[PDB]
Design a protein around this ligand. Sequence first.
Ligand SMILES: CCN1CCN2CCS(=O)(=O)N(C)c3cc(C(=O)N[C@@H](Cc4ccccc4)[C@H](O)CNCc4cccc(OC)c4)cc1c32
Length: 374
Amino acid sequence: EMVDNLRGKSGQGYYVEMTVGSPPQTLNILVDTGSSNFAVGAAPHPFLHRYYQRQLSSTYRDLRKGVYVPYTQGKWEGELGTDLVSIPHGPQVTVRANIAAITESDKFFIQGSNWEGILGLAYAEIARPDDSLEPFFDSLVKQTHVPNLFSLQLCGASVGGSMIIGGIDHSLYTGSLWYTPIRREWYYEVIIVRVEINGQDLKMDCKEYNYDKSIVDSGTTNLRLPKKVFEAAVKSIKAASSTEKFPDGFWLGEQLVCWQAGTTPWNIFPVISLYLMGEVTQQSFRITILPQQYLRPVEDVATSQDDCYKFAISQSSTGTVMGAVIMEGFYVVFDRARKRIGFAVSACHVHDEFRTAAVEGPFVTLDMEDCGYN
Ligand SMILES: CCN1CCN2CCS(=O)(=O)N(C)c3cc(C(=O)N[C@@H](Cc4ccccc4)[C@H](O)CNCc4cccc(OC)c4)cc1c32
């Protein structure tokens, strides 16, 4: 039914099948917890196989309002309207939703990605043009009896996974679910209270980890870190991996590292532990990230005598982003109803014979400081 209803290509987002208009036009839509607009290509573009044709939908209504959305990467502009929307491999309901018909774009659509639009699953507070444009999931919950919750199991060229709408599929994770509070309903903002690289605390004032916010974002590929944290992390990872020396360009994400097929030296790269604020005062839990996650494979037939990777941790000036490579191998529950995000080990979790991704707790901290930046 809903299990395995996501596809994708590495570094290019995960998408779900949707239909818009009447009769239904089928489109693949990138699932994005880091924005709040539902938008679809609605005019020819070199990288689009198909696009939303408003003239062929009897139920389309123009809202006579333009909209512009700049992301960290890429931007588009379009015309707002509403139409009927469904998810073939989700709940069997049909909802009228706001849709931005994209008429121009810059570095947004990706050659070969196989998606034609984006589903912003965050809150109205960051919807453009403003917060009166009701996001899709809000519309879904208002117009049907779907529980106000969804979960994402992203798995690691072709990738897959599941978006479970309205509930939690227990066959998709093992162990316990640990919940961290949604600090504010705009992005899915959370609080990181501690960061360790191979068990070694980075030793920063914990507000540094959340300057100016930390978010959980399926629509961004990398773990993005504030400059101060990024530099400390790179130094610690370099030192752990010092048995091999890589060009500075690798660490900046401007260059691949490759090894002969099957011989990637996983064991010289450290695990990264991110401790998230718990549901009880001064308690936390950690999720552990292996190099199989933060060294992202770049598929290319020309380089295929080797396995090559990009360093999927990069610097941010807009706060921490726990992107797709962080979510991969975890089952992540976006529990809007109880303003919390849950993490558990995924059915498709990453591991070799020495180490595995984990979600564990509780941990206690004596420093009663608030790690939230504002
Ligand atoms: C999947 C496409 N992709 C591939 C590569 N990289 C590059 C490395 S990276 O992950 O560090 N990074 C900068 C990158 C950043 C983004 C990126 O901005 N993704 C957006 C969705 C999106 C999906 C497909 C194409 C273009 C954009 C999120 O929505 C942003 N969420 C935070 C945010 C920021 C600013 C405004 C805003 O408004 C709502 C929201 C995407 C990539 C990369």
